[PDB]
Amino acid sequence: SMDYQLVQHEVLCSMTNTYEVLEFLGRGTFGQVVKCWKRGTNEIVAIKILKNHPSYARQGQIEVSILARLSTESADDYNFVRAYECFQHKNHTCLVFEMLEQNLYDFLKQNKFSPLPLKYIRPVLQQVATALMKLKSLGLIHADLKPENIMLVDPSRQPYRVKVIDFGSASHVSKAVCSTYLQSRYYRAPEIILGLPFCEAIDMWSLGCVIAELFLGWPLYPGASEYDQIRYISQTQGLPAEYLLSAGTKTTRFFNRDTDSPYPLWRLKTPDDHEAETGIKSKEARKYIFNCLDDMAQVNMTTDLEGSDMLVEKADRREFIDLLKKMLTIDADKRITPIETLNHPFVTMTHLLDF
Template sequence: METQWVAEYPHAAMEKRPRKRPRLTWDMPPPLPSPKGPLPLYCGLELMNGSGANHLFSSYYYPGVSRNASPPWRGDDKDGHYVFAVGENLSARYRILSKMGEGTFGQVLECWDLEKKEFVAIKIVRSIHKYRQAAMIEIDVLQKLAKHDVGGTRCVQIRNWFDYRNHICIVFEKLGPSLYDFLRKNSYRSFPIDLVRELGRQLLESVALMHDLRLIHTDLKPENILLVSSEYIKIPDYKFVPGSSKDGSDLKNLPKSSAIKLIDFGSTTFEHQDHNYVVSTRHYRAPEVILGLDWNYPCDLWSIGCILIELCSGEALFQTHENLEHLAMMERVLGPLPQHMMSRADRRAEKYFRRGVRLDWPEGATSRESMRAVWKLPRLQNLVMQHVDHSAGDLIDLLQGLLRYEPSERLKAREALRHSFFTRDARRLNYPM
């Protein structure tokens, strides 16, 4: 079977569902203007000129930009984001190369570390008090993880942090694209089960480390899991007849390396902290969070179960933005919610049940489209069998343990790592770390 080796990923403008934090790391940027051209537009005020690693040294020679000088003082934009221009310095040490992404917290820039001579990703937090406070908590978590993540193989490594013009700046190692970006730019084609097994193993090891340190991530999702390398291979997609497509759609992409790292600890909480608030991105939110019940470590394991299904199928399991529909989808895939959880739901969640004994569905559905979205979902066993060839039985059993409604009965991270899904077919693994 012939394979084509590729070092960069082509841009494909495709989107199936709204996401909280779209990342642009893998997009192929346009070339920088020549030294005789105009200065780059200020990011945060206008659309920036993209950059990339291959434009590193040309970015050093913008007219009017001194190699080591700090840029002129500018006010932040209306949302408190730092306003910058590609080619400028961020402090005397870092040269800005491109914008990698943006979220509620601030923005992430690709930079060149002039001291260490390496590429880094710098998270620049908005100059708003609550985000600055959250950033300091994240730095505490990152430093704690760095002390215990031997070899730095499980969680993104913090390189440095500093306060620059009222913005907390956190310097990270530069990694590859997120698993979500890989799926999206690969037309949401699923991963082979052997690769899912290795990705799942690493994710569980990362979460097990966090839980050992009494930390709860609370926002696990494919966007927050990054491949270490951007390299990938092209192989024939068995769903297409070889050579049947002139546009290359009969080929699918696979990561050249399976190595991943967990990122985004801005929502991470310590076990002893207050847990009386909503956590997790919608698609990966555990039932106890929706029902207003106490949540803890098991909410991370529910998210992992949802992620594994998404990696196998290519699409999020619970594609919804409304609580009642979300609960109805859970019952469709996993069976009815336990009576004792329904009876303990808080006041905000009481309205989702009829007399506290069953879900108010389909009577409470907001539309026929909502009802169809629920009814089209298959049971968990059938869903897995649609996308998995070998190891389906072991995967179904693992998912049933990760997606148990009752948090106390859900598998713990280290228990899941001992599951036969990871131990029975160890010899099948052929993805380099």
């Protein structure tokens, strides 16, 4: 229908190159990704075919332009997917990319959703943080940072080497209206849930969510709904400060003023009450429930580690949970920046130089 009918050995012809399709890789919201041979060479490329509908075309245009703007000496050094050229094929916008093998969700699934050791998280974090730092420097917001939009180039030959993909939803800071609906729910920053002003800082929330997921091998805050998403956060991290709630355009979707402002007593709607007045049922969707983020320090501790090698782990976790809290700071103004994360002990390993 909206999805171009895949053809058994289709020839996708741009103006400078021609491409043979080898493998249908799957379909997403944007469209489908197909593995292709670049005729008369030895290189294999991923080609994103967007849906026929005009909207997607802008999304591709948006993405195209940002990749156009991000076309420079090296995407490789700042760990975002190399885009090559954009072309039309039967009322279909097609984008050519470097082939990438596996997103972090697929990887985790392959690993039976067992937690990733911190020593393999670290490089991933470094790369994504680096990407974010580049984005900031261009005043860009990615706005869909999530496991499926971080892809391992080639896990076997290049362990833990990642590219950020999909700049379809990306955006300049100068254009960021309050109470815009952005981000995958699990990776959505409070400032979007509550309808507060926002910027590149939202991506840092997503990054925190991603690294916690990796640590746990399951999402930290898997809300079925914005109500659930904010309830979960609130349980673990406390209610967002009054000043945040009072300013949010969406606050009263989820919270009541139990006393009149000024100095209002904000309380989360009870799940029951919420259900009553919305027609949305509250679920319990999470494998791990934490009274605070500190308690993450102690879960899934290896029971097969002696002396110095457990001390190291203890140290490492402490550094991790310290960065994670900074990343998952509800007020964006107080939230750690990419550069700061890059100079945090957990990344730089300064905390391990004496073992």
